[PDB]
Design an enzyme around this catalytic site. Structure first.
Site, PDB file in Angstrom:
ATOM      1  N   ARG A 224       0.856  -1.200   0.000  1.00  0.00           N
ATOM      2  CA  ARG A 224       0.000   0.000   0.000  1.00  0.00           C
ATOM      3  C   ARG A 224       0.898   1.258   0.000  1.00  0.00           C
ATOM      4  O   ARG A 224       0.909   2.025   0.982  1.00  0.00           O
ATOM      5  CB  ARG A 224      -0.919   0.005   1.224  1.00  0.00           C
TER       6      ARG A 224
ATOM      7  N   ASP B 166       2.355  -8.128   7.282  1.00  0.00           N
ATOM      8  CA  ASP B 166       1.264  -7.433   6.580  1.00  0.00           C
ATOM      9  C   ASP B 166       0.134  -8.312   6.082  1.00  0.00           C
ATOM     10  O   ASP B 166      -0.453  -8.008   5.047  1.00  0.00           O
ATOM     11  CB  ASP B 166       1.791  -6.579   5.407  1.00  0.00           C
ATOM     12  N   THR B 167      -0.191  -9.374   6.812  1.00  0.00           N
ATOM     13  CA  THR B 167      -1.313 -10.222   6.386  1.00  0.00           C
ATOM     14  C   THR B 167      -2.336 -10.314   7.528  1.00  0.00           C
ATOM     15  O   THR B 167      -3.342  -9.581   7.522  1.00  0.00           O
ATOM     16  CB  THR B 167      -0.808 -11.618   5.918  1.00  0.00           C
TER      17      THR B 167
ATOM     18  N   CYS C 270      -1.179 -20.531   0.120  1.00  0.00           N
ATOM     19  CA  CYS C 270      -0.452 -19.961   1.263  1.00  0.00           C
ATOM     20  C   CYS C 270       0.146 -21.009   2.191  1.00  0.00           C
ATOM     21  O   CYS C 270      -0.532 -21.952   2.616  1.00  0.00           O
ATOM     22  CB  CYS C 270      -1.392 -19.040   2.051  1.00  0.00           C
ATOM     23  N   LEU C 271       1.436 -20.865   2.475  1.00  0.00           N
ATOM     24  CA  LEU C 271       2.092 -21.746   3.432  1.00  0.00           C
ATOM     25  C   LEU C 271       1.939 -21.284   4.880  1.00  0.00           C
ATOM     26  O   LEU C 271       2.167 -22.051   5.801  1.00  0.00           O
ATOM     27  CB  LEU C 271       3.578 -21.922   3.080  1.00  0.00           C
ATOM     28  N   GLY C 272       1.562 -20.033   5.068  1.00  0.00           N
ATOM     29  CA  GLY C 272       1.406 -19.491   6.414  1.00  0.00           C
ATOM     30  C   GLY C 272      -0.005 -19.655   6.980  1.00  0.00           C
ATOM     31  O   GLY C 272      -0.295 -19.148   8.066  1.00  0.00           O
TER      32      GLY C 272
HETATM   33  C1  HEM Z   1      -4.561 -13.797   6.746  1.00  0.00           C
HETATM   34  C2  HEM Z   1      -3.300 -14.166   6.503  1.00  0.00           C
HETATM   35  C3  HEM Z   1      -2.776 -14.529   5.117  1.00  0.00           C
HETATM   36  C4  HEM Z   1      -3.345 -14.471   3.885  1.00  0.00           C
HETATM   37  C5  HEM Z   1      -4.756 -13.987   3.477  1.00  0.00           C
HETATM   38  C6  HEM Z   1      -2.359 -14.979   2.937  1.00  0.00           C
HETATM   39  C7  HEM Z   1      -2.523 -15.077   1.575  1.00  0.00           C
HETATM   40  C8  HEM Z   1      -1.651 -15.691   0.691  1.00  0.00           C
HETATM   41  C9  HEM Z   1      -1.884 -15.863  -0.736  1.00  0.00           C
HETATM   42  C10 HEM Z   1      -3.151 -15.386  -1.470  1.00  0.00           C
HETATM   43  C11 HEM Z   1      -0.806 -16.495  -1.265  1.00  0.00           C
HETATM   44  C12 HEM Z   1      -0.643 -16.941  -2.741  1.00  0.00           C
HETATM   45  C13 HEM Z   1      -0.156 -15.806  -3.608  1.00  0.00           C
HETATM   46  C14 HEM Z   1       0.131 -16.369  -4.949  1.00  0.00           C
HETATM   47  O1  HEM Z   1      -0.818 -16.508  -5.769  1.00  0.00           O
HETATM   48  O2  HEM Z   1       1.318 -16.657  -5.186  1.00  0.00           O
HETATM   49  C15 HEM Z   1       0.106 -16.738  -0.168  1.00  0.00           C
HETATM   50  C16 HEM Z   1       1.340 -17.353  -0.309  1.00  0.00           C
HETATM   51  C17 HEM Z   1       2.260 -17.475   0.699  1.00  0.00           C
HETATM   52  N1  HEM Z   1       2.112 -17.079   2.020  1.00  0.00           N
HETATM   53 FE1  HEM Z   1       0.369 -16.352   2.869  1.00  0.00          FE
HETATM   54  N2  HEM Z   1      -1.215 -15.315   3.618  1.00  0.00           N
HETATM   55  C18 HEM Z   1      -1.418 -15.047   4.966  1.00  0.00           C
HETATM   56  C19 HEM Z   1      -0.539 -15.249   6.009  1.00  0.00           C
HETATM   57  C20 HEM Z   1       0.766 -15.704   5.838  1.00  0.00           C
HETATM   58  C21 HEM Z   1       1.762 -15.740   6.864  1.00  0.00           C
HETATM   59  C22 HEM Z   1       1.483 -15.332   8.314  1.00  0.00           C
HETATM   60  C23 HEM Z   1       2.895 -16.229   6.322  1.00  0.00           C
HETATM   61  C24 HEM Z   1       4.250 -16.470   7.013  1.00  0.00           C
HETATM   62  C25 HEM Z   1       4.620 -15.832   8.116  1.00  0.00           C
HETATM   63  C26 HEM Z   1       2.625 -16.496   4.924  1.00  0.00           C
HETATM   64  C27 HEM Z   1       3.517 -17.057   4.050  1.00  0.00           C
HETATM   65  C28 HEM Z   1       3.271 -17.345   2.735  1.00  0.00           C
HETATM   66  C29 HEM Z   1       4.237 -17.971   1.873  1.00  0.00           C
HETATM   67  C30 HEM Z   1       5.661 -18.413   2.282  1.00  0.00           C
HETATM   68  C31 HEM Z   1       3.586 -18.059   0.543  1.00  0.00           C
HETATM   69  C32 HEM Z   1       4.246 -18.571  -0.742  1.00  0.00           C
HETATM   70  C33 HEM Z   1       3.730 -19.874  -1.306  1.00  0.00           C
HETATM   71  C34 HEM Z   1       4.258 -20.040  -2.703  1.00  0.00           C
HETATM   72  O3  HEM Z   1       4.463 -19.018  -3.429  1.00  0.00           O
HETATM   73  O4  HEM Z   1       4.460 -21.219  -3.095  1.00  0.00           O
HETATM   74  N3  HEM Z   1       1.310 -16.135   4.649  1.00  0.00           N
HETATM   75  N4  HEM Z   1      -0.407 -16.230   1.015  1.00  0.00           N
HETATM   76  C1  LIG Z   2       0.263 -11.962  -1.744  1.00  0.00           C
HETATM   77  C2  LIG Z   2       0.867 -12.253  -0.378  1.00  0.00           C
HETATM   78  C3  LIG Z   2      -0.198 -12.202   0.727  1.00  0.00           C
HETATM   79  C4  LIG Z   2       1.594 -13.589  -0.414  1.00  0.00           C
HETATM   80  C5  LIG Z   2       2.307 -13.604   0.927  1.00  0.00           C
HETATM   81  C6  LIG Z   2       2.668 -12.136   1.186  1.00  0.00           C
HETATM   82  C7  LIG Z   2       2.104 -11.432  -0.038  1.00  0.00           C
HETATM   83  C8  LIG Z   2       1.975  -9.913   0.099  1.00  0.00           C
HETATM   84  C9  LIG Z   2       3.020 -11.905  -1.136  1.00  0.00           C
HETATM   85  O1  LIG Z   2       4.014 -11.143  -1.764  1.00  0.00           O
HETATM   86  C10 LIG Z   2       2.728 -13.350  -1.419  1.00  0.00           C
END
Ligand code: HEM
Ligand SMILES: CC1(C)[C@@H]2CC[C@@]1(C)C(=O)C2
Ligand SMILES: [K+]
EC number: 1.14.15.1
Length: 405
Positions: A177, A242-243, A348-350
């Site tokens: 943002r 930032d999620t 998402c892995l998180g």
């Molecule tokens: C409400 C919380 C969250 C939401 C809505 C969210 C959403 C997402 C989404 C939509 C993607 C896929 C993006 C794409 O199309 O490549 C993603 C990927 C990922 N997220 Fe989350 N996320 C959240 C929390 C987290 C947290 C807390 C972590 C780690 C501290 C995390 C780590 C990752 C990682 C490592 C990927 C990469 C997977 C890949 O590209 O193979 N996320 N997340």
């Molecule tokens: C789209 C996301 C939520 C996902 C994890 C963090 C984020 C901002 C990314 O750059 C990948």
């Protein structure tokens, strides 16, 4: 402003939606994006905002494009183009097959086994933060909880000092943002400037923290490079900072404004996990894109090699064609359809960490502060971007009818 219309885009598909400042933002950011789902808006539109790009407006198209990495590549996944071109985080900026080997390593640091063991600590911090706030009868929820709770869990996991939060949170926010003071490329270089020496330090003297694990990691049996480690750690810091931070504020704002829903979870606490899922649908918040690898006709529209397409994860679950009465929150919804955590090979892995943070928050907040509301005369303002959020959320309650656990 508005980019010149490309010669292959017909006027009837033009809808000038601005993902960084949508016109209906005062209604709520999800409502603002949901204007793309009004009956007269095609399934796939072109906006001249932000350099010009397609937007898929319906769950069906959004899911299809996320599955089809051969046509819709993650190599340029951010709008505007200069941000997507600079963006090089791993595994986000990669397509299969190469993307895949990096997921196991990310799983090691943020996946279920880490989360399972993060348990007592997540629980203890939630309780501590909330108990501190409880007797005040008021808080600024964004700064007093939504930020420090998930951010401290992350900084602990990553072995990074809490005093670094203001800097890192500012940089992360410029990537999702931007306030205009930094380009995406500048913010990303500043994040890398922070990370590079730390990664080298932890390759020399490894710890058990997430940065050490990534930095000393293997990927399908060969050593990760310093460059790859940095690219993975940048992503982890954006996920950590930032999620969940933004999502908690949408959820708490909703609960502040809906006593009946608070009552439901107080009376039937076992419904909390299901409520978490429904809130993840209703208050979905991410919008990423892809780039066309070739000319491609998709749902009757001629897309051109190199065109960007915004595929808002946010929109699938708000689509009436996926969920009836989609703006209505129903904890007893029987088929909660969403792509809040993504779709396809980048799921998402998180998400396990995120759900634990959400569910712990809902339980421990409602235990201590069951009855709260938006502060007198406050108008809650949202903000839109790659990840959407809540600018400020002042809450009040009567502390005299609360008690310590
Ligand atoms: C409400 C919380 C969250 C939401 C809505 C969210 C959403 C997402 C989404 C939509 C993607 C896929 C993006 C794409 O199309 O490549 C993603 C990927 C990922 N997220 Fe989350 N996320 C959240 C929390 C987290 C947290 C807390 C972590 C780690 C501290 C995390 C780590 C990752 C990682 C490592 C990927 C990469 C997977 C890949 O590209 O193979 N996320 N997340
Ligand atoms: C789209 C996301 C939520 C996902 C994890 C963090 C984020 C901002 C990314 O750059 C990948
Ligand atoms: K790129």
């Amino acid at each position: 402003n508005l980019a010149p219309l490309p010669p292959h885009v017909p006027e009837h598909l033009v809808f000038d939606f601005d993902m960084y400042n949508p016109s209906n933002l005062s209604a709520g950011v999800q409502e603002a994006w949901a204007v793309l789902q009004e009956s007269n808006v095609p399934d796939l539109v072109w906006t001249r905002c932000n350099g010009g790009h397609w937007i898929a407006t319906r769950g069906q198209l959004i899911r299809e494009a996320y599955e089809d990495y051969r046509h819709f590549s993650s190599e340029c996944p951010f709008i505007p183009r200069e941000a997507g071109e600079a963006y090089d985080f791993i595994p986000t900026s990669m397509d299969p097959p190469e993307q895949r080997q990096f997921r196991a390593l990310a799983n090691q640091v943020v996946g279920m086994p880490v989360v399972d063991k993060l348990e007592n600590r997540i629980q203890e911090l939630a309780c501590s933060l909330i108990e501190s706030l409880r007797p005040q009868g008021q808080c600024n929820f964004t700064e007093d909880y939504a930020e420090p709770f998930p951010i401290r869990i992350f900084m602990l996991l990553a072995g990074l000092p809490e005093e670094d939060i203001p800097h890192l949170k500012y940089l992360t926010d410029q990537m999702t943002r931007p306030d205009g003071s930094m380009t995406f490329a500048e913010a990303k270089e500043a994040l890398y400037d922070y990370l590079i020496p730390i990664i080298e330090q932890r390759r020399q003297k490894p710890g058990t923290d997430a940065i050490s694990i990534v930095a000393n990691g293997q990927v399908n049996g060969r050593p990760i490079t310093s460059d790859e480690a940095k690219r993975m750690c940048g992503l982890l810091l954006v996920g950590g900072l930032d999620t969940v931070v933004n999502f908690l504020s949408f959820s708490m704002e909703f609960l502040a404004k809906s006593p009946e829903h608070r009552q439901e979870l107080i009376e039937r606490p076992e419904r909390i996990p299901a409520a978490c899922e429904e809130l993840l649908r209703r208050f979905s918040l991410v919008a990423l894109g892809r780039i066309l690898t070739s000319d491609y006709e998709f749902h009757g529209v001629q897309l051109k090699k190199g065109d960007q397409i915004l595929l808002p994860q946010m929109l699938s679950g708000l689509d009436e064609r996926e969920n009836a009465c989609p703006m209505h929150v129903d904890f007893s919804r029987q088929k909660v359809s969403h792509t809040t955590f993504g779709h396809g090979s980048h799921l998402c892995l998180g998400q396990h960490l995120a759900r634990r943070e959400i569910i712990v928050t809902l339980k421990e907040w409602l235990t201590r502060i069951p009855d709260f509301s938006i502060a007198p005369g406050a108008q809650i303002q949202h903000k839109s971007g790659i990840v959407s959020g809540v600018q400020a959320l002042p809450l009040v309650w009567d502390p005299a009818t609360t008690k310590a656990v």
